[PDB]
Subunit: 314 residues, 3 copies
């Protein structure tokens, strides 16, 4: 199967500069080379160049709506294109608001996909419920069919078409939800495993449930949107919104190891890596390495080991 890495050095999704450097960092760590060592064919599409919308006035509270809307529309085009060619797309973030187009594009080619969202945050605030106008905290609100029209249209997002329903998404790692958001997920009946459920059940039982819940009936393409801030700050400190008591390096790899095993991984997002937010160079190396490892894990690398078929090492 083929893999296509797509860089999305975007940052207007939130106030902290640096996320745009995310893709450069991840590549600097050899993410592309290390992937070629797997059983997948890898092609790097390079980084997309986002045209900056001049005079992007705030919509009520939302910030840089036109810049974010255009960047995502551009990405969705590219993702749809690679998915059409039957390749698995791997989007390297900036911030998480690039998920709007990543999932959208994907949806265009595979309308029956399910979303597994590893994050400490739900990112489901609507333009009306955000305390900050930061869109990196509103991606899912633009994608949910059930949330259609429950908020005014936003300059630059007209092209978006709610592609997934509250039934096609599962959150893992939830632990810093806003009141509005918590209302939304309880009201819409969205399935989620907050840190307290992971503690109660074990990462193993959790993964087991999420699959029977999203794949119980029909086997379908999987879109993994992975917010690096889902793991505990001790593992991925280089993020804009770290929250303590998160997923461990082990749990993170388990999730990715389980999703590879399903053979259904169709789309991936490695978001929020911010190379400039590392307090010590090591903290950045820690964060990038982890991200890289998780990605490699998504495509085959197991902790038990890997050996090439048909080769007799004896």
């Amino acid at each position: 199967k083929p893999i296509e890495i797509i860089g999305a050095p975007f940052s207007k999704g939130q106030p902290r500069g640096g996320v745009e450097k995310g893709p450069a960092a991840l590549r600097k760590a050899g993410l592309v080379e290390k992937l070629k060592e797997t059983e997948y064919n890898v092609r790097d599409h390079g980084d997309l160049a986002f045209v900056d919308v001049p005079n992007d006035s705030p919509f009520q509270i939302v910030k840089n709506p036109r810049s974010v809307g255009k960047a995502n529309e551009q990405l969705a085009a590219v993702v749809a294109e690679t998915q059409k060619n039957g390749t698995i797309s791997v989007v390297l973030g900036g911030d998480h608001s690039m998920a709007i187009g990543s999932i959208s594009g994907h949806a265009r080619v595979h309308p029956d996909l399910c979303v597994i969202w590893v994050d400490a945050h739900t990112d489901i605030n609507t333009p009306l419920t955000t305390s900050s106008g930061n869109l990196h905290g509103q991606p899912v609100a633009f994608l949910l069919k059930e949330l259609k029209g429950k908020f005014p249209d936003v300059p630059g997002f007209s092209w978006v078409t709610p592609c997934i329903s509250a039934k096609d998404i599962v959150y893992i790692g939830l632990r810093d939800v806003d009141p509005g958001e918590h209302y939304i997920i309880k009201t819409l009946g969205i399935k989620y495993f907050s840190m307290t459920e992971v503690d109660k059940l074990g990462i193993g039982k959790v993964m087991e449930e999420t699959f029977s819940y999203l794949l119980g009936r029909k086997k379908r393409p999987i879109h993994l949107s992975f917010d690096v801030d889902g793991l505990d700050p001790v593992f991925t400190p280089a993020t804009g919104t770290p929250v303590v008591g998160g997923l461990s390096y082990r749990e993170g790899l388990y999730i990715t190891e389980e999703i590879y095993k399903t053979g259904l991984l169709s789309g991936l997002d490695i978001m929020e890596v911010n190379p400039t937010l590392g307090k010590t160079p090591e903290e950045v190396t820690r964060t990038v390495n982890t991200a890289v490892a998780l990605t490699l894990s998504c495509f085959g690398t197991k902790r038990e080991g890997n050996h090439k078929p048909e080769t007799d090492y004896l």
Copy 2:
């Protein structure tokens, strides 16, 4: 329901200076303000002023018996008073020896309470079994009915009345128990979940058991005495007696999260926070922050999120 914060800036329960500053640190973090943001009514009673007993000679090995005895007597009066007004009492330590009065007062108004003791220690040494005369390590020995008269009376504790039996207490996090203590808990049949039981069972099953064991028959008021050194030193390093391999930040919040859900929380103790024992300012912030979080967790705050009832965020 109402909450009453009572400061117990006491430290003669042990040899390390600084615990008395515990309450000041905890408040300095907004513990009171953050609580008000919950669905409970909060009233800060302020810190109690403990009169220092002059010429407090050691009773055999026990140190500052009269000072500790008087300080607890005073606190028990105050706790009894607020419990009477049907308010939930939240005691902010210095050292754990203030648990004698905190639970005693509580017991006077609710004689059918059960105690959940999260600690790395049993604190059940008798005046006869302590290697050190430190009373912060003997609190439960003064409160257990089964231990009545199994040791000589101590100057300043005459007022104490053993209020709870070996059947009304459950330990969670045990991992540094003295021989004498381990004899006591094995002999008396006290229920406990040492770190090995947590590892074997999972924090989830543990909490489940402790409840069916203490509430299986009669639902009763719950007194949570939380020694911050029950969590691993990596989370709460600013304590006098840190012991490696303890409960994680996650497991701590799960305990508090489950106890809130029972709706039975009647009394609480956040002990051993010692702001002067942090090697770096951060270590102290870490420790205070997690103590604050645990407390907020006891009164509602969930990691999955919180939203105000009757408010339509849409």
Copy 3:
């Protein structure tokens, strides 16, 4: 029952200087005195003096084969001798290549023993499948009957006799396995619990399974070969090959606590402690202390506590 500590200050099993200082560090921490405090009789045999083979030319890629071969031959003699006298042998390493003779000797007296190998590495590379000629990474390859003759004879190991089969060994902690090794363990059907299986199952269910798998049918002597690099670097940083995402301090003690309870522990190895690899004195103290703790745990010390029989502490 009697214990016999045997020092193996050997290091030619790998490139890094220092491991030979392992036994000295462990004693320096009071390992022998602390053991005497247990219900076992302890006898320190002292450190073996290994004669250095001059002109030890590399066998193809394998390094210092004659020195490693002779050192292990000597140890196997000593271990055989103490096992014969019905004592439990506890070998203190240098590197893990000393397991060859540790297990070999053991096997001579107890040919029906099973091996529990806690390590982040399988150490099953053959002289033909090593990227480095480091023998500390080929111990099991010299001990497995199924691997006999699957590689050329190595100068210094003629005395070795494959004593255990792929059925008598269980790995716990695997997370950095080479391709050749992963082929070998998959091909031979070797039972293992890589970090992903620990995450999935929980240390408790893992220990449960390894026992029914190795002791389900016949109860037999147990040889615990413990590579300190099996725990995460945050617990035992002073080792030549640390790999992140390893077993926790708690999980390590659980394993040892469960093995003690079986009453079958017959041989032990505490390998890879390298006092010179600690970045800060504390890192070395951390690593030594936890190795000492694990060892004490193997012989009785429980985290729930210990009291002496027939003594009435009341």
